Amino acid sequence: MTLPAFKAYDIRGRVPDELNEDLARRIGVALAAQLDQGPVVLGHDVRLASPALQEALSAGLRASGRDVIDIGLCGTEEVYFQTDYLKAAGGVMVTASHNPMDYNGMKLVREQARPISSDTGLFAIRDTVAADTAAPGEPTASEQSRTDKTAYLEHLLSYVDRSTLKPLKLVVNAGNGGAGLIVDLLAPHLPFEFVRVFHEPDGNFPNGIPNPLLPENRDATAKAVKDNGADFGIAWDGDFDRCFFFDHTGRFIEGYYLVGLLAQAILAKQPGGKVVHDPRLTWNTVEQVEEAGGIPVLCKSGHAFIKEKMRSENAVYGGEMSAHHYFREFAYADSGMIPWLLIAELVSQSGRSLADLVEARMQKFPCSGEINFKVADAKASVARVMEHYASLSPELDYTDGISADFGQWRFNLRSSNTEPLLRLNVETRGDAALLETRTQEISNLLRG
Numbered sequence: 001m002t003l004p005a006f007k008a009y010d011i012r013g014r015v016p017d018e019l020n021e022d023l024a025r026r027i028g029v030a031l032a033a034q035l036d037q038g039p040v041v042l043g044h045d046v047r048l049a050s051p052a053l054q055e056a057l058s059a060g061l062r063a064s065g066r067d068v069i070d071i072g073l074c075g076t077e078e079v080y081f082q083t084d085y086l087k088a089a090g091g092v093m094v095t096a097s098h099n100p101m102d103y104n105g106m107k108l109v110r111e112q113a114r115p116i117s118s119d120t121g122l123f124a125i126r127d128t129v130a131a132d133t134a135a136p137g138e139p140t141a142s143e144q145s146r147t148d149k150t151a152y153l154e155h156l157l158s159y160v161d162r163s164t165l166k167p168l169k170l171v172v173n174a175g176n177g178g179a180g181l182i183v184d185l186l187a188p189h190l191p192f193e194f195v196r197v198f199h200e201p202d203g204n205f206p207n208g209i210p211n212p213l214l215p216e217n218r219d220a221t222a223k224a225v226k227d228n229g230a231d232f233g234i235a236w237d238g239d240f241d242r243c244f245f246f247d248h249t250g251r252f253i254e255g256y257y258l259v260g261l262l263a264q265a266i267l268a269k270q271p272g273g274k275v276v277h278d279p280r281l282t283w284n285t286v287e288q289v290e291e292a293g294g295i296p297v298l299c300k301s302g303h304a305f306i307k308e309k310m311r312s313e314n315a316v317y318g319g320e321m322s323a324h325h326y327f328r329e330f331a332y333a334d335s336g337m338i339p340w341l342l343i344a345e346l347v348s349q350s351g352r353s354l355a356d357l358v359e360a361r362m363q364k365f366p367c368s369g370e371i372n373f374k375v376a377d378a379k380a381s382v383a384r385v386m387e388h389y390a391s392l393s394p395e396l397d398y399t400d401g402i403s404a405d406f407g408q409w410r411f412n413l414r415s416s417n418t419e420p421l422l423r424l425n426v427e428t429r430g431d432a433a434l435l436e437t438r439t440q441e442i443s444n445l446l447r448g
């Protein structure tokens with residue numbers, strides 16, 4: 001076999017059998033051999049095991065003569081920002097993002113925070129780690145503590161014109177992850193009145209693991225918004241590289257619509273720019289980007305494809321329907337902080353509620369949401385669907401699974417690259433009835 005913890009985009013496994021201090025130190029040694037010259041930035045999330053995992057990573061790296069910059073407890077996006085800002089050779093974030101409590105992992109990048117994935121070094125690291133029986137060497141390089149967030153915070157604030165901000169009332173829900181530390185540091189520089197829910201970092205997660213997609217966790221943010229008459233609410237996953245929005249009615253906003261919203265926000269600052277988006281749900285993004293004078297660029301879903309395409313295109317912003325938002329100026333990396341600052345600035349400047357900013361777009365391009373199927377035979381199942389729709393002659397695109405455009409409706413059907421799973425997305429041209437009948441039709445075919 002091979003080490004299960006090494007996935008397509010990152011390392012994720014149960015502690016201690018899938019991931020432990022010895023593997024972490026071995027990963028540091030193997031990572032040293034993969035990077036260009038320079039030091040390595042290390043950071044970690046709130047999980048109880050994360051500091052020790054970072055400490056082993058450090059020991060392996062310095063045993064290989066790599067200077068380590070320890071930026072401490074942080075969000076995943078701070079490892080991206082600091083790796084790029086400090087012109088490091090690389091960086092690793094120790095995080096479980098949103099996995100259960102007996103789980104942990106790492107997210108690895110090289111220069112300029114470029115991702116290290118299965119096929120761009122991560123499996124090379126895996127195989128080196130898998131075959132490494134050598135004795136732990138002793139450190140021949142140093143560790144520097146660098147917890148100053150000033151540059152990071154100034155960079156967050158630079159996305160908005162602070163004198164145009166209104167004193168909005170915002171619910172913030174860290175889910176006992178790490179987002180609250182950054183909110184509290186931004187707060188003295190912002191006019192908003194914050195309503196803090198599940199604010200303190202707690203690696204035991206007394207209120208549940210930080211996953212705003214769970215309806216139980218969703219409802220705590222919705223309730224705080226409604227009970228306090230907040231303008232909107234924001235929730236983050238544990239390492240807060242994803243954020244999730246709730247309008248003034250408590251309604252969770254499906255992430256598809258935030259791509260076109262955030263693209264328009266950005267395009268008013270950087271006119272004529274290119275905007276990268278995924279193929280799962282498209283029509284609304286294409287229209288909003290073009291309406292805002294931008295150029296939409298279709299790209300295979302997955303954060304490493306998005307970033308690579310943004311780089312080759314000098315795209316100012318890339319957005320994925322699944323709550324990933326990437327920013328050229330942020331080392332082409334994703335942030336869970338920039339999107340809500342942009343949204344709060346848009347609400348402040350426009351005088352429109354978050355609800356009204358998206359409502360007409362949701363009516364014009366209703367979507368199913370991402371619907372997952374675990375089926376006995378994915379390939380046979382997909383063939384059943386294509387067979388059933390063949391007579392209608394859809395316009396097909398194979399950028400990322402199968403996209404079929406029927407005119408008034410379209411779908412994308414993909415195999416997940418991170419899970420053995422089929423993923424379905426359907427949208428229509430302003431037709432909620434057509435949306436439901438087609439979604440159900442495709443579901444039955446897949447389940448057949």
Ligand SMILES: O=P(O)(O)O[C@H]1O[C@H](CO)[C@@H](O)[C@H](O)[C@@H]1O
Nearest residue numbers: 301302303320322416417418419
């Ligand atoms: O559908 P997939 O292949 O399993 O990818 C999903 O996870 C990726 C990494 O978080 C994301 O980059 C993708 O956009 C998506 O959320």
Ligand SMILES: [Mg+2]
Nearest residue numbers: 097237239241
């Ligand atoms: Mg995350």
